[PDB]
């Protein structure tokens, strides 16, 4: 639902690169392959962590809050 904090296989921290990855795709006009390498994700265990992630949090945030303060 949200970007994992650590790579499942080797434990590298990948939860602080989601926004950078999206920025590279949008503003830098880079393909997903080049963006992953620029972020320092070399082992393919880490690449699939960011490459195949589905951000379902955005869909959930569209619903109005159940309890508003």
């Amino acid at each position: 639902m949200i970007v994992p904090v650590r790579c499942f296989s080797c434990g590298k921290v990948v939860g602080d690169k989601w926004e950078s990855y999206l920025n590279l795709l949008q503003e830098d006009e880079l393909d997903e392959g080049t963006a992953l390498s620029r972020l320092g994700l070399k082992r393919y265990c880490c690449r699939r962590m960011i490459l195949t992630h589905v951000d379902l949090i955005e869909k959930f945030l569209r619903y109005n809050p159940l309890e508003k303060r």
């Binding site: 109005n64 809050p65 159940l66 309890e67 508003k68």
Partner: protein, 45 residues
């Protein structure tokens, strides 16, 4: 005593055993029990 929340207008209500189950503001008939105010412990594993 108990504070309930409407499921359509998010209005916090206070109902007794005699009060009818319904929102007094918008008229909805679905109410969500409010989150407990007591702290709950969780393990980060």
């Amino acid at each position: 005593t108990l504070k309930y929340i409407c499921a359509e207008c998010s209005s916090k209500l206070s109902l007794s055993r005699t009060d009818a189950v319904r929102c007094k503001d918008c008229g909805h008939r679905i109410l969500l029990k409010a989150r407990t105010k007591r702290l709950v412990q969780f393990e980060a594993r």
